Structure formats: C-alpha cells, structure tokens
C-alpha cells in the first residue's frame, strides 16, 4: 500500500480520504462533541489556508480535499470562493458542484446566494445554462437583468449579453439598487466571456477592460488574477495581429522577477509565451516553453479522470494548441525557406489544416487555430504563385471559421470581417462566389424565429449578393455550383412566400421598400405574388434536383423538393404531386433514414390521389434500395387484403419471400382480414402458400394458449357473446364453435395441467348450458370462476409444446428467430444472428388482472431471451407505439440540438400473436422504483409506515371509501385540496431517490452524471407519453435499469389521450410526477434541464405533424379499441392541435368532454382541469399556437399540480 500510494496520486487520494473518514467515524466513540467541534474548526481553518495558499493546482490533491470536505457536513462549511477558484483552476468542477450544493442543502434570506453565484460559475465553466436560469428565476437572482442576459446568451447572443451586463454593472440604482459584489463580478466575468466569443481585436481591447477602477504590477488583485487569462489572450491576439505595444512584454518581464509569478506562467501559459517568442523570433525559448507545456498538459491529462469527458475535450484543445505551434517550429530552418519553394508547406496546410475541429471544440479553439495558422503562414512568407496558394489557404481557414460558426448557429459573427472577405474575394470569381454562398448561408441560419419579418426586411441581403450576372461563374463551375444557386434561390423564395402567407400583415410587408417591389416582380394582388413566388421556388428546386441527378446531395435535393411540395399539398388540402412523389421515390431508391421516414406520407399521398399514383407506380414494383420498409410492414400486411395498389404487394411478397421470418407474426395478426377483392384473395393465398412450416409455430402458439388460464378465456368469451347478442346466431354460432374448440372438446393440442383438466371438467357442462348459437351467461360465468383459480403448467418444462418439452432444433424444421430484432434499413440482414434454439425453460408467472407469463428461453448462440406473455388485447397498437418511438428517436437524431444534447429513448419490442394472446420482451436489467426505494429506506419502516399510515391516513377518510370518492370529487375545494395534499407529503419521507442514487454512486461526479442522464430520460419519457396521450397508473408502471440509470416507460395500455375519456376513475394527470421527482436534486426547481429538454423536444416536434398523421392511423387506428372500454378523426385532430401548439388545460377539457361529459361534476372536473389556483387558471392567456416555453411551463404548472393536490385515486398513490 505504501509502496504504491506514492506511485499513483489517485490511489493516494482514495486511501487518504478513506482513512480520514474511518478515523473520524472511529474517534467520536470516545470524544465529546466539544472536542469534535474544536477539531472541526481547526481543520476548516487548515483547509482554508491550503486553498488560499496554494499556487499550483494538483487535480488529485484538490479533489481529495473536496472529497474530505464532502464526507462530513461539519466540514461542509469551507470558504466557497477558494473552493470555486481551485476547482476552476484544476478542472475539478463537478466535485465542487456537489460539495457546494450539499453545503447549501445542509445549511438550509441567508446570503447563500454567495455559494449560489460561484456555483453558477462552474456551470458556465462546463457550459450549462438552464440551471443558471433556474437560479435566477428564484429570489436568488437579485437582478433579473442578469436573467435577461442569460436568456440572450441562451441563443448564443454576445453583443446583447455584453450590453445587458455592462448596463447592469455601470448602473447602481435600481428598484432595490446596490447589487451584491458577487453579482457584478459574475456580470463582468460573463462580459469577458462574450468578448472572447466576439474575439475581435477591439472587442478584445474591451476584454482588456482597461483595468477598471485603476486596478506582476496588475497581477496582485485577485479579481485581476481572474482577469489575467483574458488580459493576456487579448494582448497576444492584438500583438500577433500586428501591434507592437510591448506593454504586455514589459509585464511579462516584471513577472519574470518573482519565481512564483513566472512559475504559474509556464504552469498555465507556456504555449502563448512560445507564441510571443516566435513573434519575437526567439525560437529557442519558444521551443523550450512549448515542450514544457507538452509535458505539463500530458501530466494533467494523466491526472484527470476519463469520465470527466468535457475535461478531456478541453485537454485535447490544450494539447492541439501546443502541437500546432510546435509543429510549426519543427520546420522553420530545416529544409531552406528563403527561396526553396518546397510544396510540403503547400501540402501540410491542406485538409483545411487537417481537421480544424469541425462542429465541436468551440469558438475559442477555432479562432485560436485560425490565428496560429495565419501567423505561421505570414512568418513562412516573411522568411521566404506561392502568395496565391498561401492566400487561398488563409481563405479556406476563414471559410472553415464561417461555416463552423453557422453550424453552431452562431449569430454574433464578424459580419464586417465577412464583408472584408468579400472585398478580397472579388479578386477572383470562384473565391468571390464561394464567399457569396457563405454569406447567404449565414443569412439563412439567421432566420431563426422572426425569419418572416427578418427576411421580408432583408432578403438574405439582396439574395446571392445579386450575383445573377456570373451564375456559377457564368456556369464555368461544376453543376453543383448552379445546383446550390438554385437551392438558395428556391429556399429564399419559399421563405418569403411562407412568411407572407403566415403573416399577411407583416411589419415589413406594409413597409414601402425596393424589397417589396422586387418581391412583387418575383411573384399588385398578394395572391398573385405568392403564387409567382411559389412557382419560381418550385422551378428552382426542380433545377437544383435535376442538376444533382446529373453527376448523397441528390438525395438532399429530393428531400428539399419533396418537403416543399408536401407543404404545397398540405396548404392546398384542408397530377401535380405525381413527379414530386416520384422524386421522393428516387431518393428512397438510395438507403437513407430521412427518406425512409416519409414512407407513411408516401402511402397517404398514394391513397389520397390514386388517379396519378396508380399510373406512376408501374415502375415501383421493386424500388427498395437494398432491404428496408420492415418497420411499417404491419401497415401493409393488413392492407394487402384491402383493394390495394399492386406494386406494394409485389414488394412485400419479395420481402417476405427472401425473409420468411419477421413477417410471420404480422401475417398471423393480419390473416384475420370480388371483382377486385379476388386479387387480394389470390395474393393472400400466395403469401400463405409461401409460408414455411407453420405447423411448428401453430403448436408453439397453442402451447402459449395452454399456459393461459382457461377461466380468463371463458370470461372473455362470455363478454363477447353478451356484446354480440345485444348478427346473432351466426357470430354467436362462430364464437360458440370457438368456445367448444376451446373448452368443449375433451382434448387440447399440447397438454398442460390446469387447462388440460379444465377442458374435460367444464366444456361439456358449458355446452349443456348453451345449445344456443344474458343472465344465464352471467350465472354460468360466476359458477365457473368460483372453481379452481390456480394455474399449473405441466411442471416448469412446457409439455404444452412438444418443441419445448423435447425435439431440439433441427435443420429440417425452420428454426424461429428472436422476435423484433430482424430490422433492415437498406441492409442485408445477418443470418448468423441469434435464433430460437435450446431450452432455458422455467415458467415464471406473475399475479395481476392478466397474470403475465414471464417465459425464459435459450438462444441459438446460447443467450437467454426474456419474454412476457399477455392475454386478450390487440397489441398492434403497441407495435405502432414502438415504431413511433423509433421515429421520434430518429427525429432526435436529425435534430442538431438533440443530437448535441445526446437525446435518445430506450425502447422494447412487443409481438402480439393474436388479439387474445400476445408476447412482449422482458429486459432483466431493469427494476421498478418501489422496491428500489423500499430497500434503501429502513425495512422496519418500509413495512410499518407503509402498511398502516400510508394509504388510509391520506386517501380514504378524507374521501369518505369506494364510491365516496365520486361525491368528494363533487365536494372538492381548493382549501381541502391544499390540506389533503400537504398531509400527503407530510405523511411520507423524501430523498429515497437520493439514497438510491448514492447507493450506486462511487464518485460525486459519477452520481452527477447518473442523475443528469436519469432526469433527461425521464423528461423524454414524460413528453413522449403525454404527446402520445398515454398515462401510467402508478409508480410501478416505470422500470429503470441500474447499468446506466435508464428509466423506461411501462404499462402503456391506455389509449391515445384516453385516461379518463373511457375511465370512470379520473386519470387527468399530464405525466407521472411525485415529490421525489422534485427530490432528484433539491436546490433546483424544475425549471432547468428538464425545461430545456421540453423546449428542444417541442422545437423538433414543430415539423412532425406532416409525418405523424401519416403513420399513427393508416388503416382504422385499431378499430373498436375506442369503444371496447368514437372516430380516429377526432384523435388525429387532437394530435394536430397539440403538436401545432395548444393549451394543455383546453386539451384536458376536450378529453373530458368526449366520453366523460355525462359524469356528475363534469363541469367541476373541467374547472379543476384549468387549475384549482389562480396561478393555475391564468393559463387562458396562453392559447393554441403559443410558444414552446409557455406551453411546457403551463403544462408543468396548471395541468400537473392542482389535480394531484386535490383529486386523485389511491391506486395512483398521489403521495407517490
């Protein structure tokens, strides 16, 4: 232990912290509280000294100090400022965050704002901003001008943020006036950050701040110590730009005297010292310092931990910054660079200087590499046709700059620098026009939310710079150049036309300008103008598409044209689509998910306009790129029986012919269903003839039914016969025959133990009862149910199937595959995949209304396959739900923000064999939350406090029993609402989620990442199922896997937007929320990361309506499902209203009106749907079409709280 502790700092820190904690837990056994308090004060002073006296920042050392602090609450009272400074300097942000937040929590206004604001610093040290607004949306935020600047920088605004912070600091008189010093310090720090973001040399002079208040001469103030990196970055950028002030050089010379100042300088600033020495032409010292920086940053990288991934990214930035300058100095005087034009310099600069950190490594790294490369090039020419090559290299550098900034959707650009780029670009046509599309793409990305009036004001600043004199350099460039010109022209035409149509009273439309006249010319009546604009946009989209065809990018042109024309049809709806859907199919001919997702839209446009599609489709017999359309086969496998356009049958029969499996169960579920219908009859006959050895699969399904309870099947049959009797004696005859084959026969294919005797003991009695084919049916049902309820399989082994009892997989019988994992997206499916071979049989039976059957199976490659068996319900709607889960996950993928936020959803597979018998996969790494919290909290309490005083004391007497809940819903009021709710949370402890999360937490930052991932997953689930209109009755409808803390939504048996629509028990919740979902991390108020997740999700969803409507209902949307507990048109209307922006309370009232209007106190229920509080009723002011933030916040506030406070069922466990 001692032989290794000195060798590795990390193990030394772990050992030291562990032994400290152990000795502290040991000493109190014989020490009094006064002694312990005195020791605590002494050690707090010691740690304050350590942090305030250290010049170096050893990550293990400071991390161990922070860990020791976080071990004990008594220690959790150290100086926040020193901790913040050390963690920021030593890149130990997360542990500092954890200790600071828990110190705030244990400290329980008090000026905790102090430890708040410094906390916020680390948050934008890690680039996290929603927690920042969550801080300022409280009384913690003293000046909301800082909140305004926060929301400004949220959209990457820096000039406006600089203005807000400057006017905050420059003004000292307010409604309260005199902000705290910490607030102003944070304001100026953010001003420094944005002046770095807008890294212009004059903006960097602002970043120099002129050392306000007349503040190693200036290295003494600690505020100036913080400013020092800003100061030196500004000064060095100005100097390398060409300045020769040498004031910073003199400062460096002064700092040279005093070993600590210069020592810190090479500790953190060696690379820029080498930069200056190169500017000083001091290659010797520059090389020395740069290799010193290499050593130091390598050591720091070795010190920091891997799962601090952002820290590793920053270290990569540092090391590449070192490497660019060192590789520059590596060839200064090594081959001859006075007149020897070695092409290596023209070679090493290529590939835009070898990956200039595209789409990642934010602006600072970008312009750092840019200035490094340009300085290197300038020096190379200084020591030295070739000038053209070096200028072109610089131009490529700056175009990487511009297009990167546009990729990050940056808007605080140097537009004047871009104009200078244009000025030097007009030197040659190609470089000029390249700058032209750079500028127009910038203007495109600038159209963000006000793009309507923004573009009507300036049409991309005279779109394409009015370069329609040298289009594609007089068409001398490639076909792609004119193709992109057509792309941009059609894009701006579409933008203008949609802006005018959406806002016929646009502010700049009324404005009289040459832009209005030229828009009229490109289109005076407004309808004529918009028609001409749309026509020209379509024409240029077609030109770009055909130019793309004549040579990836062609798929992109197809996407653009198809989306524009789908928009045209959608605005036309309340011939022309032929060629555009043909171009869509042409895109589909190349495997690409963005083209694949439009498949339901293609089906809808096929069926809505057959008059031309039935003629286009002659070439669509086999248009699959390689192998895809599997995810939607259900929507065709039942539509095949319908009189359906033939080529889709040809494609699907080819699919199921080369892939007999993965359609077998869809074909089984679609097998239950003239002049033209005989075509479908012969098609289904051909398909079922193409089916392979269905006898084994039928035996397997019969075995699964044998496992199912005959009592439940008889009850379902009785319900069906009662429903059908109320035509009769033919459907009654058919299902009577079914029942006779079920129980009436004294036999069953495959032998069980419960049903195997139930048949021979009750089927003949039933047949005697009913030779027919109401009350007598009820009497027979109650007489049969009061019999033996226990279900016994023939042991653990399944004799119900010979295949499961014996008869191992053989090549003669077509081996079955694991369900739901044979998907293709233009991909040849593997055949060494895992299939169904071997027996890992053990009957695991649960107890519920359906008693699900967890069945354990062995795989072809010896893998255990967990499957759950469900009884009578058409689960094809669940298959639709899973497919839409995949679709929305893809939508997250195509979204830039969600992909940057790394947003994805965990999904399972459901395979219903029949409506009366379905199968669902099981995961075996996930668990409910109830046990996961009951074990953490003491088991004695888990038993007692949850048995007696959990359900009774908060849900029954206040609602009094069953039935009295109705009358108390009539009698519900705000006062009893608040009283009952408060009694509910007082009845139950909290932070069990915290105890769990720390139970699988090894390091504080690991716990932080776990909580972040868990909260992100929960927010995604909530928005998903609320949009789906699917509730979850209670806590146990949510599983979570401990491998990555991934919660998964379970028990989605409710219909779309039907939780009280056909349910007498009210389930008006928007999502499953509890006090623990608040307890995930208390110092936060549910206005941060989950709120940003909601905003981004809805922003992505602002374009789905054109797609989801095409896929959520394609056939009937599961007929009779909305009446077995109605029109799918109502459901699609509600979905469109919700996705286009809607008031959630209005949605709840609409749902209550449909199928629940007749209930007593229906007016009371729709009133409490608006909210029991005025701060919940006020949601009238936001209405359909409202902003994303307004919709999500009102959904969080007025739809979630008041109902759970006042009106809830014990099954929901409102305490949970």
């Amino acid at each position: 232990l001692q032989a290794v502790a000195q060798r590795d700092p990390i193990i030394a820190k772990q050992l030291f912290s562990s032994l400290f904690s152990g000795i502290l837990k040991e000493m109190d056994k014989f020490k009094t509280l006064s002694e312990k308090n005195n020791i605590t004060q002494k050690l707090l002073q010691d740690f304050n000294r350590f942090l305030n006296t250290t010049f170096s920042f050893f990550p293990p050392f400071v991390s161990c100090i922070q860990d020791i602090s976080c071990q004990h609450a008594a220690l959790l009272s150290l100086d926040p400022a020193a901790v913040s400074a050390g963690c920021l300097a030593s890149l130990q942000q997360p542990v500092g965050i954890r200790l600071l937040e828990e110190a705030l929590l244990r400290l329980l206004l008090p000026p905790d704002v102090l430890r708040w604001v410094e906390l916020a610093k680390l948050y934008r040290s890690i680039g996290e901003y929603d927690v920042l607004r969550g801080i300022f949306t409280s009384e913690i935020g003293t000046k909301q001008i800082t909140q305004s600047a926060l929301l400004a920088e949220a959209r990457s605004d820096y000039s406006e943020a600089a203005k807000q912070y400057d006017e905050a600091l420059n003004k000292q008189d307010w409604v309260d006036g005199e902000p705290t010093e910490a607030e102003k310090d944070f304001w100026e720090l953010a001003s420094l950050d944005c002046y770095n973001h807008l890294a212009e040399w004059k903006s960097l002079e602002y970043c120099s701040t002129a050392s306000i208040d007349s503040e190693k001469i200036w290295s003494e103030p600690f505020y100036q110590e913080t400013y020092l990196p800003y100061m030196i970055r500004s000064k060095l950028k100005l100097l390398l730009q060409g300045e020769a002030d040498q004031s910073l050089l003199t400062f460096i010379d002064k700092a040279m005297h005093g070993e600590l100042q210069k020592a810190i300088l090479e500790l953190h600033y060696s690379q820029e010292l080498s930069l200056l020495y190169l500017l000083q032409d001091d290659v010797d010292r520059a090389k020395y310092y740069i290799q010193n920086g290499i050593q130091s940053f390598m050591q720091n990288y070795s010190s920091i931990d891997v799962l601090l991934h952002q820290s590793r990214l920053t270290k990569l930035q540092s090391v590449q910054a070192l490497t660019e300058i060192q590789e520059f100095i590596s060839f200064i005087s090594k081959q001859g660079n006075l007149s020897s034009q070695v092409p290596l310099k023209r070679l090493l600069n290529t590939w835009t200087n070898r990956y200039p950190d595209a789409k990642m490594d934010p602006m600072n790294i970008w312009d750092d590499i840019i200035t490094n490369r340009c300085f290197f090039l300038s020096k190379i020419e200084e020591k030295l046709d070739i000038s053209s090559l070096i200028r072109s290299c610089k131009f490529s550098m700056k175009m990487k700059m511009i297009d990167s900034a546009r990729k990050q959707n940056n808007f605080s650009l140097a537009m004047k620098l871009l104009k200078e780029l244009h000025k030097e670009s007009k030197t040659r046509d190609d470089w000029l026009v390249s700058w032209v599309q750079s500028y127009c793409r910038l203007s495109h990305c600038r159209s963000r939310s006000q793009g309507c009036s923004e573009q009507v004001l300036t049409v991309l600043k005279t779109v394409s710079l009015l370069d329609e004199n040298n289009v594609s350099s007089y068409l001398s460039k490639n076909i792609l150049a004119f193709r992109d010109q057509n792309i941009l022209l059609g894009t701006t035409y579409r933008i203008i036309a949609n802006a005018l149509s959406s806002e016929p009273a646009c502010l700049a439309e009324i404005e009289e300008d040459k832009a209005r006249r030229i828009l009229e010319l490109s289109g005076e009546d407004s309808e004529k103008v918009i028609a001409g604009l749309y026509q020209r946009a379509f024409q240029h989209l077609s030109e770009a598409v055909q130019a793309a065809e004549e040579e990836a990018g062609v798929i992109d042109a197809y996407m653009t044209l198809a989306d524009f024309c789908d928009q045209q049809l959608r605005k036309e709806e309340e011939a022309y689509p032929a060629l555009v859907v043909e171009k869509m199919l042409k895109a589909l001919k190349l495997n690409s998910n963005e083209a694949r997702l439009k498949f339901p839209r293609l089906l809808q446009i096929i069926e809505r306009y057959p008059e031309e599609t039935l003629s286009l489709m002659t070439k669509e017999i086999s248009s699959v790129p390689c192998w895809q359309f599997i995810s939607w086969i259900s929507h065709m496998v039942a539509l095949l029986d319908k009189d359906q356009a033939v080529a889709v049958q040809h494609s699907v029969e080819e699919i199921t012919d080369n892939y007999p499996q993965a359609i077998v169960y869809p074909f089984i579920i679609s097998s239950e269903s003239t002049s033209t219908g005989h075509k479908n009859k012969e098609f289904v006959a051909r398909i079922k003839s193409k089916l392979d050895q269905g006898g084994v699969i039928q035996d397997f399904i019969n075995a699964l039914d044998q496992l199912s309870n005959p009592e439940l099947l008889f009850k379902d049959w009785s319900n069906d016969v009662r429903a059908e009797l109320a035509v009769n004696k033919k459907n009654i005859e058919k299902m009577y025959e079914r029942m006779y084959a079920a129980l009436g026969d004294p036999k069953a294919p495959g032998l069980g133990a419960f049903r195997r005797k139930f048949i021979q003991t009750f089927g003949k009695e039933f047949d005697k009862h009913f030779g027919k084919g109401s009350d007598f049916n009820d009497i027979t049902n109650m007489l049969l149910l009061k019999m033996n309820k226990d279900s016994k399989p023939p042991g653990n082994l399944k004799e119900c199937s010979p295949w499961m009892s014996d008869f191992k997989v053989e090549f003669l019988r077509n081996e079955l595959e694991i369900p739901g994992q044979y998907d293709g997206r233009g991909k040849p499916l593997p055949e060494y995949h895992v299939r169904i071979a071997g027996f890992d049989e053990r009957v695991t039976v649960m107890a519920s209304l359906r008693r699900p059957k967890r069945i354990i199976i062995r795989g072809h490659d010896e893998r255990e396959h967990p499957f759950l068996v469900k009884g009578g319900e058409d689960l094809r709607q669940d298959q639709r739900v899973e497919q839409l889960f995949q679709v929305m996950n893809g939508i997250l993928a195509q979204d830039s923000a969600c992909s940057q936020r790394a947003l994805q959803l965990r999904t399972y597979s459901v395979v219903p064999m029949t409506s009366r018998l379905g199968l669902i996969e099981w995961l075996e790494n996930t668990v409910t939350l109830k046990d996961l919290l009951l074990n953490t909290m003491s088991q004695e309490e888990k038993a007692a406090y949850l048995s007696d005083p959990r359900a009774p004391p908060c849900e029954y007497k206040d609602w009094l029993d069953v039935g009295a809940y109705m009358l108390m819903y009539k009698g519900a009021n705000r006062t009893e609402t608040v009283t009952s709710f408060r009694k509910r949370e007082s009845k139950v402890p909290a932070d069990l989620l915290k105890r769990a999360f720390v139970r699988m937490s090894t390091s504080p930052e690991a716990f932080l990442a776990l909580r972040s991932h868990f909260a992100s997953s929960h927010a995604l689930i909530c928005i998903s199922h609320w949009i789906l209109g699917i509730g979850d009755r209670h806590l146990n409808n949510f599983m979570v896997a401990m491998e990555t803390g991934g919660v998964i939504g379970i028990d989605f048996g409710h219909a779309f937007g039907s939780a009280t629509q056909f349910l007498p028990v009210p389930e008006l919740m928007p999502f499953r929320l509890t006090r623990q979902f608040i307890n995930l991390m208390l110092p936060m108020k549910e206005t941060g990361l989950m709120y940003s997740i909601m905003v981004h999700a809805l922003r992505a969803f602002r374009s789905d309506p054109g797609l989801l409507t095409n896929t959520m209902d394609v056939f009937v949307k599961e007929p009779s499902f909305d009446w077995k507990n109605w029109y799918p048109r109502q459901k699609i209307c509600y979905a469109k209203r919700k996705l286009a922006g809607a008031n959630p309370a209005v949605i709840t009232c609409d749902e209550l009106l449909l199928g629940h209007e007749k209930a007593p106190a229906f007016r009371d229920y729709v009133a409490v749907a608006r909210g029991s509080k005025d701060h919940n009723i006020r949601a009238q002011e936001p209405e359909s079409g409202l902003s994303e933030e307004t919709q999500v916040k009102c959904l969080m506030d007025q739809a979630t709280d008041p109902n759970i406070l006042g009106r809830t069922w014990e099954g929901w466990e409102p305490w949970m």
């Binding site: 290794v4 590795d8 390598m298 590793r312 090391v319 590449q320 490497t323 200039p356 991932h1013 990555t1044």
Partner: protein, 115 residues
Amino acid sequence: IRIRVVQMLGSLGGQINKNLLMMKSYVAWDREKRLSFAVPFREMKPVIFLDVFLPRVTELALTASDRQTKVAACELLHSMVMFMLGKATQMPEGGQGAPPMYQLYKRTFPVLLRL
C-alpha cells in the same frame, strides 16, 4: 514516444481526436461495502472499505509503464484479492447460492486471468 504521440494527435485535428472517447461505461461495481478492513493500531481500529480501490488498481495492474510501478500494483492486487477471498469464508454472505462478492468476482477474475 509520448512527445511524438502528442505530435501526431495535434497534427491529426479534432475530427478524429474526438473519437478517443453509450452506456457511459460506469456501473459502480458493488452496491455494498462488503469488503472492509479495520486498520491495526495501538489505540483505535478504524475500518476501511477496500472496494473503491479494486477497479483503479485493476487498470493500474493492467496498463502502466515503469515496470516497478506495474509490479507493485500487481502485488497490491494480489494482496487485496488474497485477503478478500478469505473474508467471505469467515461469515457466509447470503444470497441465492453463495454470492459473497459475485459482482466483484465477475469484475476481477477475467482480467485477473488476462494478466
């Protein structure tokens, strides 16, 4: 070697270096501190849980230069596993069978054999 490593890393550029770093590959091996050690002394015997060290030393026993450090880490891993295997024998930890350090066994034994 490391000089040229950082050389090539910087010469490559960000678009490939980003590929240096899913489920997040963090599992927090054990839910319990079932491995413990009361340190000997003359006055008190505070108890130390050795679980947290088990993963770290693993890679330290696997990937580390300075052969002396490598062998020292392997020796410490030897000692720690050698002690912990005997701890379960003292008091039989419950479970479905005998999973006293089942998860720890799964984490350790494969890489133990690998080394």
